[PDB]
Amino acid sequence: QFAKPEDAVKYRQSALTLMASHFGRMTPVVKGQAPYDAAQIKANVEVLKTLSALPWAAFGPGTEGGDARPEIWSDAASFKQKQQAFQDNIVKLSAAADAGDLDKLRAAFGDVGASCKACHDAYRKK
Amino acid sequence: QFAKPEDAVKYRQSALTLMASHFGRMTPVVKGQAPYDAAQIKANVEVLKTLSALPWAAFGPGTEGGDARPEIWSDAASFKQKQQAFQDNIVKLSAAADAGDLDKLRAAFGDVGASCKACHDAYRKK
Numbered sequence: 001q002f003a004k005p006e007d008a009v010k011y012r013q014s015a016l017t018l019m020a021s022h023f024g025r026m027t028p029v030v031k032g033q034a035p036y037d038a039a040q041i042k043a044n045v046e047v048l049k050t051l052s053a054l055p056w057a058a059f060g061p062g063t064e065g066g067d068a069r070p071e072i073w074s075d076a077a078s079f080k081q082k083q084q085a086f087q088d089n090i091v092k093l094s095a096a097a098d099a100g101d102l103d104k105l106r107a108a109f110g111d112v113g114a115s116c117k118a119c120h121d122a123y124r125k126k
Numbered sequence: 127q128f129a130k131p132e133d134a135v136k137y138r139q140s141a142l143t144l145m146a147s148h149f150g151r152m153t154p155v156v157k158g159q160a161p162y163d164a165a166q167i168k169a170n171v172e173v174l175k176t177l178s179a180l181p182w183a184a185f186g187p188g189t190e191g192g193d194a195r196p197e198i199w200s201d202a203a204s205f206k207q208k209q210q211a212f213q214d215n216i217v218k219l220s221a222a223a224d225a226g227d228l229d230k231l232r233a234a235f236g237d238v239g240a241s242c243k244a245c246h247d248a249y250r251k252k
């Protein structure tokens with residue numbers, strides 16, 4: 001859906017910005033600094049689930065640019081590992097949010113965050 | 127969820143970028159220049175439905191900035207008109223896509239696009 005590589009870059013940066021906001025806005029809740037409303041978090045994690053499937057299709061071959069490392073493309077199966085592990089941790093976060101279980105939520109949130117960091121460290125330019 | 131007004135600006139710009147890509151990527155399909163796969167479009171419109179609910183919460187009071195006109199805030203009921211009319215046209219687009227009806231899709235797509243343009247003309251800075 002992208003006329004030029006720059007359009008893919010702009011899309012994935014926006015998608016990642018929006019994932020990051022829907023993830024990070026739960027940090028006060030996980031920490032107990034903001035109240036836990038199970039319905040609120042269930043709805044937010046449903047939004048995060050949708051968003052977390054979006055960036056990856058905008059790293060199609062030849063879309064080097066932005067802060068993406070070239071190894072995303074040359075190591076395609078490994079980059080796919082990291083994205084798929086991140087989404088299966090999103091599945092676990094959805095299960096926790098759907099269950100309305102704050103302890104399960106905290107644990108799953110931490111797993112997701114670790115998976116963000118793992119891909120970051122390997123595939124985002126310094 | 128925004129520490130500073132700039133964060134709300136960045137969020138809504140990203141959300142609008144992503145809406146725009148999920149809307150605009152169907153233009154070749156509507157025009158018949160690309161094939162119509164009903165399941166493909168149903169799934170894409172489900173993504174667009176989620177995205178089209180997101181920008182509005184990031185124009186919270188005092189978030190003047192970006193290309194947003196101040197009248198968004200001073201005319202809150204009217205800006206809410208435009209966003210709500212845009213979403214009820216998204217509901218009609220979802221119905222068309224769920225029905226797998228290319229004629230219904232084309233008509234609903236045109237209605238959505240008109241609603242994008244209406245808010246643009248009133249509330250985006252030139």
Ligand code: HEC
Nearest residue numbers: 013016017020023065066067068082083086116119123124
């Ligand atoms: C690889 C499988 C990734 C996972 C999982 C996550 N991110 Fe990431 N992110 C990744 C790349 C390769 C890039 C660079 C994209 C580019 O072309 O520039 C990024 C970028 C971000 C950004 C900045 C986006 C921007 O506006 O430029 C943010 C804020 C970000 N990523 C956050 C983030 C979070 C919070 C994640 C888990 C919820 C996460 N990312 C996962 C690669 C990957």
Ligand code: HEC
Nearest residue numbers: 139142143146149191192193194208209212242245249250
């Ligand atoms: C008001 C109810 C709007 C509707 C409906 C749509 N858009 Fe819009 N859009 C609106 C504003 C006020 C702004 C400026 C936001 C800011 O603070 O800068 C925008 C911006 C865009 C952008 C640019 C985003 C960016 O990266 O800076 C695009 C590409 C865009 N809008 C497209 C668009 C489309 C395709 C719409 C219908 C599917 C649509 N917008 C609706 C206000 C409103």
